[PDB]
Design a protein around this ligand. Structure first.
Ligand SMILES: CCCCCCCCCCCCCCCC(=O)O
Ligand SMILES: CCCCCCCCCCCCCCCC(=O)O
Lengths: 133, 133
């Protein structure tokens, strides 16, 4: 299953191309300005086979709890209501969100003890690096 | 998780567009002739969180065991070696197979107590209906 190395609290240390990723998602200007300034903490935990990913920022908090491979309802930081599925591929935690005939993916993997999140929407690709706290 | 109603032995009673589906997969003529004549039995079982799907036919037997949402190595009836993931979406068991930069999906759902498998490759769509034995 998901490596226990994912478990813990993670702080954003780098973000690249997040603005265009938010634009591709339909996020408006004022919201993107705050989104580009946020430095969220992401907390990954598990209880039995339920994994929880919580994101905390001054602007917005989000939380999802899920079992691998089982679709669930999600409300995103920009208030999309999506049907989402998290899978595990070569140790990477891959989240797909679907809504309104669209889809985006957020892939999280460990790289030299950092967690790297790659967000993709319509060919736009964002990379966010987190340091374990 | 997967409904217990999937569990059991299932016999093929109908197949539509399987030949074009096999063609889309790259299956040769002599093999497709046997594939179109086969009436496989599919046995679905589970042990803990490992689900097993076994297919039995005079021509070829196959078996996959997997956990939902976790990628695994699969060898298909036509001898493709794929990386596959089975997910659960609105009660449907959705299998994606990837190999050589290609992908196909086999979605299995229960319809009035029958199991219906829909196989899709490059816009070709096959429907196979099974009756519980
Ligand atoms: C989560 C930071 C708050 C920013 C609020 C702006 C709303 C748009 C963001 C939606 C997509 C969030 C992608 C986060 C991926 C990650 O975990 O690094
Ligand atoms: C499994 C039947 C034997 C036929 C052998 C021909 C090899 C090509 C078939 C590969 C795809 C099989 C799709 C089966 C979907 C289903 O479970 O109904």
């Amino acid at each position: 299953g998901m490596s226990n190395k994912f478990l813990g609290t993670w702080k954003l240390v780098s973000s690249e191309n997040f603005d265009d990723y938010m634009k591709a998602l339909g996020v408006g200007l004022a919201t993107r300005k705050l989104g580009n300034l946020a430095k969220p903490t992401v907390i990954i935990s598990k209880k039995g086979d339920i994994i929880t990913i919580r994101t905390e920022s001054t602007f917005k908090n989000t939380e999802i709890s899920f079992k691998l491979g089982q679709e669930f309802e999600e409300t995103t930081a920009d208030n999309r209501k999506t049907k989402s599925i998290v899978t595990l591929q070569r140790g990477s935690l891959n989240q797909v969100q679907r809504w309104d005939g669209k889809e985006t993916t957020i892939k999280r993997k460990l790289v030299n003890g950092q967690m790297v999140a790659e967000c993709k929407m319509k060919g736009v690709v964002c990379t966010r690096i987190y340091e374990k706290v």
